[PDB]
């Protein structure tokens, strides 16, 4: 007569894309739409029990989250878990729910290892995955003549979820799985100046197609030093792996988009540097249902969660929790419709997998592995204004690169520079 | 009126040094000695509740062990946990018991990260630590003129606890913490023949003082190939990081000790190769209480556990559980003696830390960090007979290298070769 959904997310810290202050209203919207639909679980009253994944300091925890999962499991026996979104929170909870034979839904947990569904059985990811970033990079290389060598620079902050490590791992493993080209990698520490000589030297010795996962300021400073040392778009291309668009404003307003602009009199130098720089992000959903969802999410979060949902790419995470929850209620109702129960985890999960669905994020495909295909945008500088705009778009389900608004990806030489220089790197 | 001890170890798989078939009788011996001592917990009846750290396939598990820890915690509210010894079992249980404010004792879990007692609070290790291996290697280098460059080769089996990784991590971090010399490292796969050209090439390009953590057969084959390629004791020294003496028989009988002997017609070549090879192991405890403990352990395991405890270095793990348990009961009795309770985890723990103790393993010192100091032996070949024997001994508490039975560490050149060759490595 009722369905129990266990939630393990940050219930108090609101800094995370998958924080409850932002995912909670998106879930309330989805439950309200289940209630208003007589074709989704008719008569059932979907209940929710919460568990905080964060530790005493407030950050998401590889200890608080699995403990919280055990509390909810023995106290309520839920049929499904929602979250966590942090990799180190999600990995132990995922192995518990795999062992409990209970499905788990999350728009977070994008790490490569969560994709091993023999271990993380009945885990369904409805948000981005870092192997899907490797798909986009693969298509980008094939559609650009780079079939030899790339370099990857990544940095994290000690004690975080290591977002850049896992991004680079997904890219690294999938790209070499599909292209088997040489992918050099190097980790640095953003606040450590000793590394910038080492990085700049490694840039001019280990690659010309260069991906950097870092903070906006680190990517900016690296660009400034690359210009100062005479590394221009004729020989080098610097991709910033800024999947949540932290270096860009939202697609709603704030026209135009300038990541190199900081207000330190360096902006003049930064623009000429960023002529060699392109930014890879998740794709903003186009469909008008998304914009209406955003308006309703903002209202419900301010009313029931005392939180203000600003615009930006991070909102695709609450939107995907929304969509994944509805995609699950459909599967339960279909499982009930053919004689199943709400605890037929494997039956429910296989109805969700290898399946296309329509949600507030538009078209969303869960692949054979249980992971949503992820679309990416590619931002590029308009050489006239200096502002960045989407010029390429990647459909994750079809793996096609389509130009955007008839734009051209800017090259100082008229075409992409070679991934390997003339007479070697020497 | 009674003390509850929770155990999380392999209850069914007997392949592990810390398996219950081998630790259980060592713990029964320790409980029986608590009963017979009126100065240790007078009147208390220490009970034990067991929990298996192993999964359905029988191997120790990052999921079974923490679940078992939660099951025992809510069912019995124990005052202390015993085990696990696997690194990936012990880390999640360690973080639970730190959060529960419950002391944890183990003779396993030797990984570098378990040493961060800010996270693994109230974790006390009474067996070996891999940073202590770095202490021995440090003393070995200081006492031999190697102050520049070493090379470390390590290999694991996919799906195990990664023993060689964690051994090499402990050595790598501690050695560079104390000597800051260049420590090159390279991982390989033992069954993959593609790696042996790469390894041999990397041996003659990245170091002359070479540590190899691998199976005996891999270390043997690597030696045969190094002789076949003309790498002898005049320029190279190959340490086998065989902490449990897997490549050697027990110190009880089986005289003499020959690791290069295999019976494949290669034994004649292997002996000349092993002239460049030395083996690092844990130190066999000397004291006669150990030998008496071994006899009682073998009897009690055959009687109550249907298991046959063979002789070897692996028996220092059950002996250290034994000693750790007595060291804990002493500390509880001392805490009760000054008005404390059995749940004053922090008071109990600090009585155990920075403390010397006498157990069946002889002299054992828990350092300031809560980790037992670890003694190492160095085995070397007698050029006349060809058999290996202990020639150097390291006292972990005093960090002294003492020659053993007036033996001389064999060198084909009369002294250790330089860690860097003549005119560079080229």
């Amino acid at each position: 007569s009722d369905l129990t959904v266990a939630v393990v997310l940050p219930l108090t810290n609101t800094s995370y894309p998958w924080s409850w202050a932002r995912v909670g209203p998106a879930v309330e919207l989805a439950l309200a739409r289940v209630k208003a639909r007589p074709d989704l679980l008719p008569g059932w009253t979907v209940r929710m029990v919460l568990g905080s994944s964060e530790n005493a300091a407030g950050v998401c925890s590889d200890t608080a989250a699995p403990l919280a999962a055990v509390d909810l499991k023995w106290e309520h026996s839920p049929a499904v878990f929602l979250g966590p979104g942090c990799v180190y929170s999600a990995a132990p909870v995922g192995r518990f729910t795999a062992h409990w034979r209970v499905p788990l839904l999350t728009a977070g947990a994008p790490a490569l290892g969560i994709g091993v569904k023999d271990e993380y059985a009945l885990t369904t990811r409805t948000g981005p995955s870092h192997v899907k970033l490797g798909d986009f990079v693969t298509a980008l290389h094939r559609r650009l003549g780079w079939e030899h060598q790339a370099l990857v620079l990544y940095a994290d902050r000690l004690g975080d979820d290591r977002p850049c490590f896992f991004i680079v791992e997904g890219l690294y493993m999938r790209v070499r799985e599909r292209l088997n080209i040489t992918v050099n990698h190097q980790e640095f520490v953003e606040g450590d100046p000793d590394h910038y000589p080492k990085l700049l030297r490694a840039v001019r010795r280990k690659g010309r197609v260069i991906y950097i996962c870092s903070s906006p300021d680190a990517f900016r400073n690296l660009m400034l030093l690359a210009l100062n040392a005479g590394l221009t778009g004729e020989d080098y291309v610097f991709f910033h792996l800024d999947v949540f668009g932290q270096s860009l404003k939202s697609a709603q307003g704030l026209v135009p988009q300038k990541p190199w602009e900081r207000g330190d009199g360096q902006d003049r130098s930064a623009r000429q540097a960023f002529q060699a720089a392109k930014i890879i992000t998740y794709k903003e959903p186009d469909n008008p249902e998304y914009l209406e969802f955003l308006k309703q999410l903002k209202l419900l979060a301010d009313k029931k969660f005392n939180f203000t949902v600003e615009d930006g790419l991070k909102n695709i995470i609450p939107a995907s929790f929304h969509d994944g929850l509805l995609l699950y209620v459909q599967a339960v109702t279909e499982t009930l419709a053919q004689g199943g129960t709400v605890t037929d985890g494997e039956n429910i999960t296989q109805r969700m997998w290898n399946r296309s669905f329509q949600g507030v994020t538009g078209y969303l495909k869960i692949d054979r592995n249980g992971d949503r295909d992820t679309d990416f945008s590619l931002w590029d500088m308009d050489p006239e204004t200096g502002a960045f705009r989407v010029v390429l778009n990647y459909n994750g389900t079809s793996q096609e690169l389509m130009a955007v608004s008839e734009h051209k990806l800017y090259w100082p030489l008229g075409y992409p520079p070679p991934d390997v220089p003339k007479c070697g790197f020497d | 009126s009674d003390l509850t001890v929770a155990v999380v170890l392999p209850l069914t798989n007997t392949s592990y040094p810390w398996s219950w078939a081998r630790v259980g009788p060592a713990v029964e011996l320790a409980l029986a000695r608590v009963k017979a001592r009126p100065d240790l917990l007078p009147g208390w009846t220490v009970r034990m509740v067991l929990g298996s750290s192993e999964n359905a396939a029988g191997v120790c598990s990052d999921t079974a062990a923490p679940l078992a820890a939660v099951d025992l915690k809510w069912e019995h509210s124990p005052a202390v946990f015993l085990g696990p010894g696997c690194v990936y079992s012990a880390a999640p249980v360690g973080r639970f018991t730190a959060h529960w404010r419950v002391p944890l004792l183990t003779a396993g879990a030797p990984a570098l990260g378990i040493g961060v007692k800010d996270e693994y609070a109230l974790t006390t290790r009474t067996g070996p630590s891999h940073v202590k291996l770095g202490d021995f290697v440090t003393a070995l280098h200081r006492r031999l003129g190697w102050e520049h460059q070493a090379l470390v080769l390590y290999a694991d089996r996919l799906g195990d606890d990664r023993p060689c990784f964690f051994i090499v991590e402990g050595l790598y971090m501690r050695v560079r913490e104390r000597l800051n010399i260049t420590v090159n490292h390279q991982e390989f796969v033992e069954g993959d023949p593609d790696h042996y050209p790469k390894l041999l090439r990397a041996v003659r390009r990245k170091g002359r003082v070479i540590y190899i953590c691998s199976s005996p057969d891999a270390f043997r084959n690597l030696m045969l190939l190094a002789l076949n390629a003309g790498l002898t004791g005049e320029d190279y020294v190959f340490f086998h990081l065989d902490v449990f003496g897997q490549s050697l028989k027990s110190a009880q009988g089986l005289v003499p000790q020959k690791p290069w002997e295999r019976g494949d017609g290669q034994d004649r070549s292997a002996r000349q190769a092993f002239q460049a090879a030395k083996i690092i192991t844990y130190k066999e405890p000397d004291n006669p209480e150990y030998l008496e403990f071994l006899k009682q352990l073998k009897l009690l395991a055959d009687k109550k556990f249907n298991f046959t405890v063979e002789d070897g270095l692996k028996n220092i793990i059950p002996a250290s559980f034994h000693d750790g348990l007595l060291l804990y009961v002493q500390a509880v009795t001392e805490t009760l003696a000054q008005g404390g309770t059995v749940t004053d985890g922090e008071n109990i723990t600090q009585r155990m830390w920075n403390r010397s103790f006498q157990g069946v393993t002889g002299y054992l010192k828990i350092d300031r960090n809560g980790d037992r100091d670890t003694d190492f032996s160095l085995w070397d070949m007698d050029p006349e007979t060809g058999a290996f024997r202990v020639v150097l001994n390291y006292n972990g508490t005093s960090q002294e290298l003492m020659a053993v039975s007036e033996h001389k560490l064999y060198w084909p050149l009369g002294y250790p070769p330089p860690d860097v060759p003549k005119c560079g490595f080229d």
């Binding site: 290892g113 | 880390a91 990260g113």
Partner: peptide
């Protein structure tokens, strides 16, 4: 497989890299 990437998800196997190319640690 990989020397740096693919090795489980636990902060215990991320205390030194040791397969990785890093300027820290």
């Amino acid at each position: 497989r990989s020397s740096c990437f693919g090795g489980r998800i636990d902060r215990i196997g991320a205390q030194s890299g040791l397969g990785c190319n890093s300027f820290r640690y």
